[PDB]
mmCIF file with all atom_site columns, C-alpha atoms in Angstrom:
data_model
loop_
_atom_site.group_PDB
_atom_site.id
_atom_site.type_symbol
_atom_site.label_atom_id
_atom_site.label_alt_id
_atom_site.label_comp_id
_atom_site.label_asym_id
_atom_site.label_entity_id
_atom_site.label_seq_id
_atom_site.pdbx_PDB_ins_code
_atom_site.Cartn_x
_atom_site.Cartn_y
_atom_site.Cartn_z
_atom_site.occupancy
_atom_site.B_iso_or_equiv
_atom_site.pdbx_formal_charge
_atom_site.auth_seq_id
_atom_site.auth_comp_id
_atom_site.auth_asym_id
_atom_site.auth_atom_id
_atom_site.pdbx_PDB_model_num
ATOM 1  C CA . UNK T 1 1  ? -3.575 -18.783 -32.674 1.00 0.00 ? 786 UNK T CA 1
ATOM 2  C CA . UNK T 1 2  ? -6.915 -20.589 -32.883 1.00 0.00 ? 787 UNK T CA 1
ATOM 3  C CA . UNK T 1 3  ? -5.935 -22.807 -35.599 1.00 0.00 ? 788 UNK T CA 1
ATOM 4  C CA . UNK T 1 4  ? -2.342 -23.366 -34.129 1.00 0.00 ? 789 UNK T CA 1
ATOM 5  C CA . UNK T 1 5  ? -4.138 -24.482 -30.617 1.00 0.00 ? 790 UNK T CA 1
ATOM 6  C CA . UNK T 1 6  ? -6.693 -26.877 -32.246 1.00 0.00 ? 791 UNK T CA 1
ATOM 7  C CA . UNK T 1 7  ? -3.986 -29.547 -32.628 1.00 0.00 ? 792 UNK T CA 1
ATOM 8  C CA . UNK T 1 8  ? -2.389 -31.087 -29.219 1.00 0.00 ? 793 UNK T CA 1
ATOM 9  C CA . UNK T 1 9  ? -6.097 -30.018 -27.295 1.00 0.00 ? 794 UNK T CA 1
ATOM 10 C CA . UNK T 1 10 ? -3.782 -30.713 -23.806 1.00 0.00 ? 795 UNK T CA 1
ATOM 11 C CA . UNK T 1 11 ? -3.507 -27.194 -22.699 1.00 0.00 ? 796 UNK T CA 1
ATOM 12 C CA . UNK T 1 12 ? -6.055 -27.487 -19.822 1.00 0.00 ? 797 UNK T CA 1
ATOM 13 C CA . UNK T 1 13 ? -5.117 -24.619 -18.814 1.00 0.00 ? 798 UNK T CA 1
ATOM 14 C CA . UNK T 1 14 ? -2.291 -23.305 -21.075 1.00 0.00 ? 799 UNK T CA 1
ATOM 15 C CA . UNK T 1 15 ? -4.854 -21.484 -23.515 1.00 0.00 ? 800 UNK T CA 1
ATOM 16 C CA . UNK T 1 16 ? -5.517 -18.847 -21.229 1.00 0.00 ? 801 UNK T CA 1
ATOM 17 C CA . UNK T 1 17 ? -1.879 -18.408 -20.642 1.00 0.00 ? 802 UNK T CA 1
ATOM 18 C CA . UNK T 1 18 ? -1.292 -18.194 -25.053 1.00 0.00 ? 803 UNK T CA 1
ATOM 19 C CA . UNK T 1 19 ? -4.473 -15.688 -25.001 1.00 0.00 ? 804 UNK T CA 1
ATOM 20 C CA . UNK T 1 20 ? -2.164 -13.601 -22.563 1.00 0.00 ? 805 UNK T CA 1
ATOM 21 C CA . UNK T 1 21 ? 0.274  -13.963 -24.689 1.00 0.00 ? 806 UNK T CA 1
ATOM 22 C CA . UNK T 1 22 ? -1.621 -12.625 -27.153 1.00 0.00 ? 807 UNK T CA 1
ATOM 23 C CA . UNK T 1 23 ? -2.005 -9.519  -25.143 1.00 0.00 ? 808 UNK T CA 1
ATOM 24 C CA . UNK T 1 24 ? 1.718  -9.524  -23.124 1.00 0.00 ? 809 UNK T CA 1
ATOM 25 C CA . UNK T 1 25 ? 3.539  -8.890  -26.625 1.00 0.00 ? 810 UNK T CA 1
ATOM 26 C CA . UNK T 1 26 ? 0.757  -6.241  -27.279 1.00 0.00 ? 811 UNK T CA 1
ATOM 27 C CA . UNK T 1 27 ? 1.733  -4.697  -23.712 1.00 0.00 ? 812 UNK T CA 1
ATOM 28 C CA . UNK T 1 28 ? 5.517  -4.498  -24.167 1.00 0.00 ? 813 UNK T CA 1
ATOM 29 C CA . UNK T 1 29 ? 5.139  -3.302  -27.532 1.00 0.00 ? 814 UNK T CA 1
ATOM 30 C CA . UNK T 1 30 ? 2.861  -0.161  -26.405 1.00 0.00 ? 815 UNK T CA 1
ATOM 31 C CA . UNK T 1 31 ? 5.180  0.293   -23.537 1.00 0.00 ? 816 UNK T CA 1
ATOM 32 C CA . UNK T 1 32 ? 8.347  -0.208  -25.477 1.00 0.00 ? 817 UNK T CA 1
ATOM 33 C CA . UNK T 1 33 ? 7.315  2.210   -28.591 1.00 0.00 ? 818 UNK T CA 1
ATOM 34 C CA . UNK T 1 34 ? 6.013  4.688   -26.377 1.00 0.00 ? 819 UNK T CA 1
ATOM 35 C CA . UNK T 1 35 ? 9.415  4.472   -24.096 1.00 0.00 ? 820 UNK T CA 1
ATOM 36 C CA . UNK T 1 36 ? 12.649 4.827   -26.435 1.00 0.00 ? 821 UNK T CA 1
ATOM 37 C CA . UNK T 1 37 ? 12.472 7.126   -29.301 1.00 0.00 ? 822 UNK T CA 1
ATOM 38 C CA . UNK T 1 38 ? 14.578 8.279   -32.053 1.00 0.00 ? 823 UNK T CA 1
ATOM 39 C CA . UNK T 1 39 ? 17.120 10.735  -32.083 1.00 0.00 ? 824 UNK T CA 1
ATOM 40 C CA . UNK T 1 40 ? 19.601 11.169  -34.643 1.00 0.00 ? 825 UNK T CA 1
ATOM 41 C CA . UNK T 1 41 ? 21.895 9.244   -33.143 1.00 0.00 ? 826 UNK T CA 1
ATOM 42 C CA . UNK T 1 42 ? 20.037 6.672   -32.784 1.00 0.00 ? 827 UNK T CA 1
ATOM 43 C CA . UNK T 1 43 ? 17.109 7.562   -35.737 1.00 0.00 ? 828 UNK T CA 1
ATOM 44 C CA . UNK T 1 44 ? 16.227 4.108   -36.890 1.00 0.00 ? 829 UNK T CA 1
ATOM 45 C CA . UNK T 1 45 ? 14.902 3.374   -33.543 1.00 0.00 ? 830 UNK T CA 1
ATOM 46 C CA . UNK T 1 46 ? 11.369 3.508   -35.065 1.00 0.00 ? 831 UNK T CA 1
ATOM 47 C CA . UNK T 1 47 ? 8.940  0.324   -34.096 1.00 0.00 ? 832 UNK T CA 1
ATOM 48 C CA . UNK T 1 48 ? 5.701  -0.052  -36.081 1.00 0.00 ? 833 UNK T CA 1
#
């Protein structure tokens, strides 16, 4: 994400928002894997 930022430099402020990006898709993806599970109905629901 560093090297694909160091290229327009106009995100006064929009780095900070991409560095919580950074962490928002690391959020939902602890609270979605933790969430919905597997069963065998629905056993490939398996997130890594």
């Amino acid at each position: 994400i560093k090297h694909m930022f160091k290229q327009k430099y106009f995100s006064d402020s929009t780095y900070k928002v991409i560095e919580s990006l950074t962490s928002a898709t690391i959020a939902l993806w602890n609270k979605v894997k933790s969430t919905m599970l597997p069963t065998p109905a629905k056993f490939h629901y398996v997130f890594n």
